[PDB]
Amino acid sequence: FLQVSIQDTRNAVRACRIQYHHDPQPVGREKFTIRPHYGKEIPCTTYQQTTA
Amino acid sequence: HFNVYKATRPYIAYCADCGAGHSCHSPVAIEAVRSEATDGMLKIQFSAQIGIDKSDNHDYTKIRYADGHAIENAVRSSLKVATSGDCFVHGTMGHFILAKCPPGEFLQVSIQDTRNAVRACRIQYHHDPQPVGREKFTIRPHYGKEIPCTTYQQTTAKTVEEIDMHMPPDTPDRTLLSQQSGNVKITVGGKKVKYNCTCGTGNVGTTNSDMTINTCLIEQCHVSVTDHKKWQFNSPFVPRADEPARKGKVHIPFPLDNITCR
Amino acid sequence: EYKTVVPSPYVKCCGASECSTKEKPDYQCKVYTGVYPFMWGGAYCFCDS
Amino acid sequence: QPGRFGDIQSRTVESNDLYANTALKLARPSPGMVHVPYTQTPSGFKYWL
Amino acid sequence: MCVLANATFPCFQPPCVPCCYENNAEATLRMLEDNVDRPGYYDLLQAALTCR
Numbered sequence: 001f002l003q004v005s006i007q008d009t010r011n012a013v014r015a016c017r018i019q020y021h022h023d024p025q026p027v028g029r030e031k032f033t034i035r036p037h038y039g040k041e042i043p044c045t046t047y048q049q050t051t052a
Numbered sequence: 053h054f055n056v057y058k059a060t061r062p063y064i065a066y067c068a069d070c071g072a073g074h075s076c077h078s079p080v081a082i083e084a085v086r087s088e089a090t091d092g093m094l095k096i097q098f099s100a101q102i103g104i105d106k107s108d109n110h111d112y113t114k115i116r117y118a119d120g121h122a123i124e125n126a127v128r129s130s131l132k133v134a135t136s137g138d139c140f141v142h143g144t145m146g147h148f149i150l151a152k153c154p155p156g157e158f159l160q161v162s163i164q165d166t167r168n169a170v171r172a173c174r175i176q177y178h179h180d181p182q183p184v185g186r187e188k189f190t191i192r193p194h195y196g197k198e199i200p201c202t203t204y205q206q207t208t209a210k211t212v213e214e215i216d217m218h219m220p221p222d223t224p225d226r227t228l229l230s231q232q233s234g235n236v237k238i239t240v241g242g243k244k245v246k247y248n249c250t251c252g253t254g255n256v257g258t259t260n261s262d263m264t265i266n267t268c269l270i271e272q273c274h275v276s277v278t279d280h281k282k283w284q285f286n287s288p289f290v291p292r293a294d295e296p297a298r299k300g301k302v303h304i305p306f307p308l309d310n311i312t313c314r
Numbered sequence: 315e316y317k318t319v320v321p322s323p324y325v326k327c328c329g330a331s332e333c334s335t336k337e338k339p340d341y342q343c344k345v346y347t348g349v350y351p352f353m354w355g356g357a358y359c360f361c362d363s
Numbered sequence: 364q365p366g367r368f369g370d371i372q373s374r375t376v377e378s379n380d381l382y383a384n385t386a387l388k389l390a391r392p393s394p395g396m397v398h399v400p401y402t403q404t405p406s407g408f409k410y411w412l
Numbered sequence: 413m414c415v416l417a418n419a420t421f422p423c424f425q426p427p428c429v430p431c432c433y434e435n436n437a438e439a440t441l442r443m444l445e446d447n448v449d450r451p452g453y454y455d456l457l458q459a460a461l462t463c464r
């Protein structure tokens with residue numbers, strides 16, 4: 001699942017939760033978790049922070 | 053008293069990702085994690101030693117950490133160690149930390165900054181403890197047997213263990229050069245720096261004072277601080293200084309010991 | 315269980331380091347050429363390559 | 364042999380000599396970086412356990 | 413048994429007593445690095461950095 005929440009103007013928590021199956025897998029041929037200090041560079045994709 | 057920690061200094065190493073997937077040279081970098089105790093306690097090495105103040109005095113609240121060839125101080129609260137879940141910190145001394153963690157696929161450690169910024173480091177580490185015996189229980193009962201096992205104790209006495217230490221290398225820095233008009237100025241403050249400028253005749257060497265070359269711009273000079281008064285660590289992420297090595301030794305706390313579990 | 319010991323590397327700026335053999339269990343040594351390492355304050359070894 | 368029971372052997376707990384066959388290898392550092400890479404077969408006592 | 417250039421002193425009483433580190437850290441550590449192989453290393457470590 002996942003939920004998003006925030007405090008109110010009267011300092012009350014407001015939340016909303018949905019069912020979402022999240023299971024990411026990295027690009028390549030190994031199912032690793034954290035990037036190493038020594039490895040290859042493989043092309044992938046991401047969302048950038050530009051607002052142009 | 054004895055105070056071995058007055059000849060040792062915290063250092064800055066490389067962390068592959070600092071909690072956000074990006075890499076930077078961080079002051080909380082994780083060296084080996086040791087998990088050779090049967091109850092399932094870990095020994096993580098920081099690069100920031102915890103339990104001593106800037107001014108070298110023992111303290112349970114202050115922790116030492118490097119900040120750009122300058123040692124800074126942080127509060128012992130906000131030291132967080134975690135895996136999939138959240139860990140309980142049992143011990144605390146020097147570079148080393150003791151914790152008991154839920155099973156997971158990584159672990160990260162983090163502290164506050166002086167500017168109240170979180171500085172962290174996570175590594176991939178497969179933790180799956182299994183209790184001693186013939187049952188894979190999670191929590192001890194109020195009625196059961198006693199079976200021998202081993203842990204790390206909180207004694208910080210003579211231990212019969214080693215760390216290699218050595219003099220830090222000459223750290224380069226480029227913030228100390230100022231170009232005014234056809235002349236360069238190098239800042240001071242108690243740090244002797246080396247310089248190597250390819251401008252004219254022989255103008256290399258070390259200095260403790262400002263000068264002006266009056267000849268060339270900053271594209272030729274550089275500064276390497278040579279703080280050379282206290283040991284740092286023999287870490288694969290920071291270079292050595294001299295070809296045949298120098299080396300030293302320091303004992304580590306928390307030795308392995310025999311207990312019984314229920 | 316064993317323990318792999320790895321000292322800090324040695325970098326020479328405008329120099330070459332000559333590999334020295336010694337009697338350690340399963341000892342390994344190499345020398346690599348053309349490094350340009352960076353540290354937090356910047357890159358040392360003026361020497362370009 | 365590497366990766367199996369007895370990859371490192373010692374004649375006694377106190378014995379000064381040690382036999383180690385663990386297939387340790389070194390690799391070049393990545394550009395602009397100081398880190399001493401290596402690849403090396405995991406322990407055989409752990410594997411046997 | 414500890415050695416300083418041409419001194420060859422007993423490790424209990426190095427000639428820098430008292431406050432070896434305080435008077436000169438540079439020299440104390442340079443000397444203490446030269447004695448890592450000697451069995452009396454830890455006594456010299458204890459005596460080099462203990463003063464009031």
Ligand SMILES: *[C@@H]1O[C@H](CO)[C@@H](O[C@@H]2O[C@H](CO)[C@@H](O[C@@H]3O[C@H](CO)[C@@H](O)[C@H](O)[C@@H]3O)[C@H](O)[C@H]2NC(C)=O)[C@H](O)[C@H]1NC(C)=O
Nearest residue numbers: 088089200201202203204205307308309310311375376377
């Ligand atoms: C947990 O307890 C066990 C059982 O005592 C420890 O194993 C034993 O540890 C002692 C340590 O002194 C060993 O004694 C040694 O014996 C040799 C015999 O050649 C002697 O030369 C040494 O000077 C020393 O006295 C003993 O052999 C060893 N094994 C046994 C009794 O089967 C174990 O070390 C403990 N684990 C800890 C403290 O982490």
Ligand SMILES: *[C@@H]1O[C@H](CO)[C@@H](O[C@@H]2O[C@H](CO)[C@@H](O[C@@H]3O[C@H](CO)[C@@H](O)[C@H](O)[C@@H]3O)[C@H](O)[C@H]2NC(C)=O)[C@H](O)[C@H]1NC(C)=O
Nearest residue numbers: 246247248249250256257272327328329330359360361362
């Ligand atoms: C300060 O920085 C300069 C770099 O601008 C260093 O000068 C460099 O020194 C090395 C070793 O002496 C020179 O390598 C030599 O190259 C010649 C070929 O010209 C060869 O015959 C020698 O056997 C050696 O390989 C290098 O060329 C030289 N750089 C320049 C631009 O001339 C200098 O060493 C640095 N000073 C200190 C104290 O580190």
